[PDB]
Amino acid sequence: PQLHNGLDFSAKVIQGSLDSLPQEVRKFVEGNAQLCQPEYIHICDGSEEEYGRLLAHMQEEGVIRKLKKYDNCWLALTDPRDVARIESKTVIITQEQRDTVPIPKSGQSQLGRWMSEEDFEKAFNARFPGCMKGRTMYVIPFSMGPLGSPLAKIGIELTDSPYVVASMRIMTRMGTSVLEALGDGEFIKCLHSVGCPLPLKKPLVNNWACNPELTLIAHLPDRREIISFGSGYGGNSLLGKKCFALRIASRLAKEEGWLAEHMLILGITNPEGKKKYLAAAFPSACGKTNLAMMNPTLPGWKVECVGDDIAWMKFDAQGNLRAINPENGFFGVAPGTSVKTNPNAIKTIQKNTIFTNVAETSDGGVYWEGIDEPLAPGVTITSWKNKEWRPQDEEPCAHPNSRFCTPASQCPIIDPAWESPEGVPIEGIIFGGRRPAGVPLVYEALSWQHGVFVGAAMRSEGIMHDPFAMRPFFGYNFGKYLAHWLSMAHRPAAKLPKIFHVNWFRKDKNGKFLWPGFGENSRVLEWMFGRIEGEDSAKLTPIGYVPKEDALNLKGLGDVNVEELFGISKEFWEKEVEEIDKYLEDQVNADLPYEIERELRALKQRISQM
Ligand SMILES: Nc1nc2c(ncn2[C@@H]2O[C@H](COP(=O)(O)OP(=O)(O)OP(=O)(O)O)[C@@H](O)[C@H]2O)c(=O)[nH]1
Numbered sequence: 148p149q150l151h152n153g154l155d156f157s158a159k160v161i162q163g164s165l166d167s168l169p170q171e172v173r174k175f176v177e178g179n180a181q182l183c184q185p186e187y188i189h190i191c192d193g194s195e196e197e198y199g200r201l202l203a204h205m206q207e208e209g210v211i212r213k214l215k216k217y218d219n220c221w222l223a224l225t226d227p228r229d230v231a232r233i234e235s236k237t238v239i240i241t242q243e244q245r246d247t248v249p250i251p252k253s254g255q256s257q258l259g260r261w262m263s264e265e266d267f268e269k270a271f272n273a274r275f276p277g278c279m280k281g282r283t284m285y286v287i288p289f290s291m292g293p294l295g296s297p298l299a300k301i302g303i304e305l306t307d308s309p310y311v312v313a314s315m316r317i318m319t320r321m322g323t324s325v326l327e328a329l330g331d332g333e334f335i336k337c338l339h340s341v342g343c344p345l346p347l348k349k350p351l352v353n354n355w356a357c358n359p360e361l362t363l364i365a366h367l368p369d370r371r372e373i374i375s376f377g378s379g380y381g382g383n384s385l386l387g388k389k390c391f392a393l394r395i396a397s398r399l400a401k402e403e404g405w406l407a408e409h410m411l412i413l414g415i416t417n418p419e420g421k422k423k424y425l426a427a428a429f430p431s432a433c434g435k436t437n438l439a440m441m442n443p444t445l446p447g448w449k450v451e452c453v454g455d456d457i458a459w460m461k462f463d464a465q466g467n468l469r470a471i472n473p474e475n476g477f478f479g480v481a482p483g484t485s486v487k488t489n490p491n492a493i494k495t496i497q498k499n500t501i502f503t504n505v506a507e508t509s510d511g512g513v514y515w516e517g518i519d520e521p522l523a524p525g526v527t528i529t530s531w532k533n534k535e536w537r538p539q540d541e542e543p544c545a546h547p548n549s550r551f552c553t554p555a556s557q558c559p560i561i562d563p564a565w566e567s568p569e570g571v572p573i574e575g576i577i578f579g580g581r582r583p584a585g586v587p588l589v590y591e592a593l594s595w596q597h598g599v600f601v602g603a604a605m606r607s608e609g610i611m612h613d614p615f616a617m618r619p620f621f622g623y624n625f626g627k628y629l630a631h632w633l634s635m636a637h638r639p640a641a642k643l644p645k646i647f648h649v650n651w652f653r654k655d656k657n658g659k660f661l662w663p664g665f666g667e668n669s670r671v672l673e674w675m676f677g678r679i680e681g682e683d684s685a686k687l688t689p690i691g692y693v694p695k696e697d698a699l700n701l702k703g704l705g706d707v708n709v710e711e712l713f714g715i716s717k718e719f720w721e722k723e724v725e726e727i728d729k730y731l732e733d734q735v736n737a738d739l740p741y742e743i744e745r746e747l748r749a750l751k752q753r754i755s756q757m
């Protein structure tokens with residue numbers, strides 16, 4: 148199948164065999180090898196020997212350091228240009244812009260970024276030819292979801308980054324068993340390169356290959372492709388997570404009738420042994436991982452984690468909304484993680500964990516802002532920028548969105564059903580974000596449609612809208628996403644979860660948090676649980692149902708200002724409704740569903756009667 152010798156890449160395979168790949172996986176690999184010109188092709192097996200050897204290789208090259216205080220833990224320090232997702236370089240390609248994002252009445256969209264097929268083709272041609280010269284192309288066969296689950300979906304990621312291979316081993320199920328499960332089926336095609344072919348054209352910084360100027364994270368849902376160039380970091384390189392399991396998957400979910408969401412999934416057991424599963428969407432920086440792994444303060448309750456970040460949810464034959472965690476690990480923010488804020492994460496991350504952009508202590512441990520624990524005298528700190536550091540210093544010792552990357556099966560409170568292939572039955576959906584003023588600790592939506600409106604009104608901070616926690620992640624037009632959520636009410640026999648909204652972040656007149664939060668949030672979960680069971684524990688208000696006086700267990704919290712935390716001001720809510728109206732008109736306009744407009748007016752009307 149060639150007149151010469153450059154099409155068949157068999158001679159460059161250094162692990163596995165192209166002949167044993169399913170036919171369409173071989174075509175994907177070989178086509179991209181022809182394009183990218185890697186030196187070597189390594190078909191990953193997912194084995195512990197492969198992983199160990201690749202960590203040791205990175206360690207020898209200076210790409211990662213072993214953290215000698217802990218068991219098989221590692222630290223990567225990046226080029227400070229690479230350190231986060233970059234929305235302006237994250238795009239979705241469709242034939243028509245409006246299918247990807249609504250057309251905003253002014254400015255640019257806050258709800259996604261479209262690129263034309265033409266522009267993408269030019270961008271691709273300016274980046275990928277030859278991009279892997281001198282490097283190994285690793286072929287990562289991975290499952291998003293428990294292997295073999297009816298709700299799981301398989302991808303193949305090609306990458307030139309060992310860091311990505313190691314991290315994908317933690318964050319997804321990868322290796323030979325996935326190829327076996329895939330057989331001749333369909334898969335999402337994921338192509339990644341750090342964009343630094345050898346010999347290097349530009350200086351390597353911190354032993355971290357990246358190409359910031361050309362960084363581009365593209366999604367082609369009608370080709371079932373994700374193509375990412377130039378960043379080695381996080382959501383830009385681990386293509387299963389945000390690119391596949393939110394942006395691609397949300398588009399698929401819309402077409403097929405299910406939901407792909409930026410939600411934790413937790414199981415909560417009351418003192419009588421009754422257990423329910425809840426899903427919660429909070430924006431980045433608003434505490435999903437804390438809640439998902441909560442150590443409850445209320446005696447007799449238990450919380451167990453199914454996932455901390457992404458949920459795929461589909462109604463079953465009996466009308467239960469079943470959720471799976473499509474991830475295999477937790478890719479959690481390190482700063483702010485302490486024994487007080489997340490004791491179960493602290494336990495989790497002491498073995499088999501990769502840390503990125505945190506500080507290292509002189510005894511080979513980790514450190515970060517908010518770790519809230521002192522070091523022995525004499526123990527010194529190296530910042531994430533590889534410089535000596537002391538607490539008085541002007542800049543943080545860890546990057547603010549530095550991360551740990553840890554196996555889920557580790558977590559001491561991992562839920563027993565976290566890999567059940569049928570998924571767990573969701574009985575409540577929680578929305579929430581950071582509202583320093585106005586918004587009570589917890590309220591319950593009046594209806595499904597009201598709950599969709601409440602999702603649409605979420606904020607990641609007082610100022611910033613982040614509907615459904617999906618602002619950076621919508622795979623398609625957010626108006627159409629709202630219509631898709633609203634359509635669930637018309638699915639016969641659907642057991643629609645109860646919808647709540649929480650606010651951990653209300654502040655008093657002095658800027659102090661009114662609610663202590665963290666494991667105390669168990670008290671709010673208890674109220675939700677009773678509400679799902681039909682307890683008469685709610686009082687009707689203009690915004691939804693709130694707890695009755697005395698309904699929340701506040702034992703141990705007598706210093707809480709209840710009236711203030713729980714207060715609803717006409718003045719605040721008049722302004723809230725006007726702000727929501729202006730935001731939806733500006734950002735959604737012609738794509739805003741009937742029923743969302745109707746919920747906005749209904750809320751305005753109820754507030755007018757206060
Ligand atoms: N006051 C208060 N802060 C909280 C609570 N739970 C979490 N936080 C804060 O939430 C932040 C940590 O949340 P993140 O790990 O960034 O949130 P996430 O939702 O997991 O974000 P991604 O992993 O980026 O999706 C820190 O600032 C915490 O102090 C709470 O109950 N009360």
Ligand SMILES: O=C([O-])C(=O)[O-]
Pocket residue numbers: 232381382431456478
């Ligand atoms: O990495 C994440 O979870 C994020 O950015 O939301």
Ligand SMILES: [Mn+2]
Pocket residue numbers: 208
């Ligand atoms: Mn070398």
Ligand SMILES: [Mn+2]
Pocket residue numbers: 435436455456478479480
């Ligand atoms: Mn998180």
Ligand SMILES: [Mn+2]
Pocket residue numbers: 409431456
């Ligand atoms: Mn997230």
Ligand code: NA
Pocket residue numbers: 209210211223224225226353354355
């Ligand atoms: Na480095």
